[PDB]
Design an enzyme around this catalytic site. Structure first.
Site, PDB file in Angstrom:
ATOM      1  N   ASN A   1       0.919  -0.711  -0.438  1.00 58.72           N
ATOM      2  CA  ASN A   1       1.293  -1.852   0.391  1.00 58.72           C
ATOM      3  C   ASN A   1       0.395  -1.791   1.622  1.00 58.72           C
ATOM      4  O   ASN A   1       0.683  -1.072   2.579  1.00 58.72           O
ATOM      5  CB  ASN A   1       2.768  -1.759   0.816  1.00 58.72           C
ATOM      6  CG  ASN A   1       3.724  -1.680  -0.375  1.00 58.72           C
ATOM      7  OD1 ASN A   1       3.898  -2.645  -1.112  1.00 58.72           O
ATOM      8  ND2 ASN A   1       4.342  -0.523  -0.561  1.00 58.72           N
TER       9      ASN A   1
ATOM     10  N   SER B   1       2.301   2.057   3.085  1.00 55.83           N
ATOM     11  CA  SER B   1       3.197   2.841   2.242  1.00 55.83           C
ATOM     12  C   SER B   1       2.769   2.595   0.799  1.00 55.83           C
ATOM     13  O   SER B   1       2.028   1.656   0.526  1.00 55.83           O
ATOM     14  CB  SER B   1       4.663   2.414   2.460  1.00 55.83           C
ATOM     15  OG  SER B   1       4.936   1.096   1.980  1.00 55.83           O
TER      16      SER B   1
END
Length: 130
Positions: free
Chosen positions: A46, A51
């Site tokens: 992401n 993350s």
């Protein structure tokens, strides 16, 4: 490993997922199906918040596992994200159980809300002997 539908349903049942915290095996199957297509080595980075999602349940590194490169992240499942990329899903299941002990329960996964919540999920376990 890419599990076949019923193979996975029996594996999850053996691991104590059926009805865990009131969550039926069909719901877990619907979740794994939509999160990764039953693929344990699936990963999604992401770029927005740095993350990465790991494994069959696409568990996120910001709060659940440690990958060493997610800013200000925690490791609630107390596992290396690597553990979530194994063919054996024991650790991924232990961590998914941890996720659902939180108030949100199965709602923690947005994909569950989109493709599983209030839907007929029976089809996921039919004929699997579970």
């Amino acid at each position: 490993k890419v599990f076949e539908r019923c193979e996975l349903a029996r594996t999850l049942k053996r691991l104590g997922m059926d009805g865990y915290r009131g969550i039926s095996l069909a719901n877990w199957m619907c979740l794994a199906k939509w999160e990764s297509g039953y693929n344990t080595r699936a990963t999604n980075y992401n770029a927005g918040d740095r993350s990465t999602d790991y494994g069959i349940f696409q568990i996120n590194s910001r709060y659940w596992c440690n990958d060493g490169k997610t800013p200000g992240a925690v490791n609630a499942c107390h596992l290396s994200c690597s553990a979530l990329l194994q063919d054996n899903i024991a650790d991924a299941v232990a961590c998914s159980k941890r996720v659902v002990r939180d108030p949100q329960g199965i709602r923690a996964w947005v994909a569950w809300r989109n493709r599983c919540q209030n839907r007929d999920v029976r089809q996921y376990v039919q004929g699997c002997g579970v």
